[PDB]
Amino acid sequence: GDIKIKIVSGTASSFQSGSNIEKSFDGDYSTLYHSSWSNGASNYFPITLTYNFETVTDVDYLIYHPRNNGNNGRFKETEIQYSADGHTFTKLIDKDFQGSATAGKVTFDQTIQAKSFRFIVKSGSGDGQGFASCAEMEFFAK
């Protein structure tokens, strides 16, 4: 009986219209958040994604679900951060999601009290210099 925390809102520093961040918290593994398809800029990365809860909440682990079809945007090198108030962020861990096509679970060394989590995606798979995309992002408490 692990509680899946309710994500109420989010932001993305890059998105393609119709694939904004909320498509990664709609409960549907086929619908994607996807960064802008125009990925030629030198400062395109990093791509920063923020997921917000309604209130500060206990969280023990998260699962990033990448797209299973297509290779554009599977996360690679990320910095994961959390915020107790939604404004000030603290580094939690550098996580290499490896460009993997399968879900990546990150389990914390303690229960984290957070109103928000943030992913600074430094690299991601795909055409050109790559993209960032996410089928679902999930947060859980034991």
Question: Binding site, residues?
Answer: 23, 26, 28, 31, 34, 67, 72, 135-136
For the annotated binding site for beta-D-galactose, the residues are 34, 67, 72
127 lies in the site for Ca ion, by CB under 5 A: no
Select the residue interacting with Ca ion from 14, 19, 31, 116 (CB under 5 A): 31
Residue 5, Cβ density class (10 Å: 0-12 exposed, 13-18 middle, ≥19 buried): buried
Q: What share of the chain is helix, strand, coil (3-state, %, to 5)?
A: 5, 50, 45
Please count the residues of the chain.
142
Total interface residues for Ca ion by CB under 5 A: 5
Instruction: Give the span between the Cα atoms of 132 and 56, in whole angstroms.
Output: 27
CB of 26 to Ca ion, least distance (A): 5
Select the residue interacting with Ca ion from 6, 28, 94, 129 (CB under 5 A): 28
Applying CB under 5 A, which residues contact Ca ion? 23, 26, 28, 31, 136
